[PDB]
Amino acid sequence: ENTSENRAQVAARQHNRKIVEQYMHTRGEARLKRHLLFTEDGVGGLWTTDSGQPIAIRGREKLGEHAVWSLQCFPDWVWTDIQIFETQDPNWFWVECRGEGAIVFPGYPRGQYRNHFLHSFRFENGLIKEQREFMNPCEQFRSLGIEVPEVRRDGLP
Amino acid sequence: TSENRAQVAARQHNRKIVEQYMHTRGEARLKRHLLFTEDGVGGLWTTDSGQPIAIRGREKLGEHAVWSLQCFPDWVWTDIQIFETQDPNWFWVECRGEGAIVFPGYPRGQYRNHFLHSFRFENGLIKEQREFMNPCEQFRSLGIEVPEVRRDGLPS
Ligand SMILES: O=C(O)c1cc(Br)ccc1N[C@@H]1CCCNC1
Numbered sequence A: 001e002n003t004s005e006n007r008a009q010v011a012a013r014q015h016n017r018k019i020v021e022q023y024m025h026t027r028g029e030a031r032l033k034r035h036l037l038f039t040e041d042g043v044g045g046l047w048t049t050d051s052g053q054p055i056a057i058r059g060r061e062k063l064g065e066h067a068v069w070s071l072q073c074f075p076d077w078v079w080t081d082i083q084i085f086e087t088q089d090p091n092w093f094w095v096e097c098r099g100e101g102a103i104v105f106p107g108y109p110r111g112q113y114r115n116h117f118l119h120s121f122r123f124e125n126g127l128i129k130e131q132r133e134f135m136n137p138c139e140q141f142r143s144l145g146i147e148v149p150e151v152r153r154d155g156l157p
Numbered sequence B: 001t002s003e004n005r006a007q008v009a010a011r012q013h014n015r016k017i018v019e020q021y022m023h024t025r026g027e028a029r030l031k032r033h034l035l036f037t038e039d040g041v042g043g044l045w046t047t048d049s050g051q052p053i054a055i056r057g058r059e060k061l062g063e064h065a066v067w068s069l070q071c072f073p074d075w076v077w078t079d080i081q082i083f084e085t086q087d088p089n090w091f092w093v094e095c096r097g098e099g100a101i102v103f104p105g106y107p108r109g110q111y112r113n114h115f116l117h118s119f120r121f122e123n124g125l126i127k128e129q130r131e132f133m134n135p136c137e138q139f140r141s142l143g144i145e146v147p148e149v150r151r152d153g154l155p156s
């Protein structure tokens, strides 16, 4: 129904969505300002690593700093095939996408990195309170020339 | 408008199927394949090989739940959160999962992971289920050495 509360919810959902879209389409130099889409105490980072522990960057300044490292390590990164999922929580979105670009990590040769990604975005007062990325670390190993372990699955149909 | 009332109906029905899927345990896992369409696809989208292990069709889903009940004999999903989307036929689930892993040729272990699941529906049944996790936790549960990525310059 058309109550003012459901209008507020819809309003917020619409503003939050535009922030998700902006985050996902940010490229090149503007990547250095993306930290401004987060709350002061916002957290962003990679939730699927080889260690099994999240790489979580806490706070806007730290996100700012890490965006510099990221521009060096992924100089031409683009997100593609982007699909945004709104949820029953107007402050929570998921995104399913791909990504591609050069990977330049010290200690390895320069490679082409492609992966499939899920992102979680949680909001608070119109800014990102928590962003989390989920991907398959095995595709990153390949991109870096690191040997991928294989599971035998004997007697799988 | 009854378009939105059909949609809301579709969403609430599909959501109960997602709940049932997620809370199925023990022997009832032999019958979960019945929640799928006949042509339905289920499986693991994050593998070491980079290709999905997709199990196509209701009958095959059934047979692969037999294998799965030997490999993961006491598996349970926990800390379940269901996300509805703007599409009444598309849901996401964030959860944990754990239990014994018992694969041929590897030492028995205890597997635990963090999981995302995508469920897409058709006529109130599951047309496509996809699981996404971190394969490195599965390696670890199997005694398989996990390489370490060096991230130099990484700040704090
Ligand atoms: O793209 C950015 O500006 C960026 C900023 C921060 Br801060 C952390 C990582 C970033 N990019 C990586 C590229 C490879 C896939 N994961 C995300």
Ligand SMILES: O=C(O)c1cc(Br)ccc1N[C@@H]1CCCNC1
Binding pocket: B029, B042, B055, B061, B062, B064, B065, B068, B069, B072, B075, B097, B131
């Ligand atoms: O739990 C089931 O009944 C099941 C049925 C099918 Br057919 C395939 C895999 C199954 N379970 C595993 C548990 C370990 C984490 N990924 C999914």
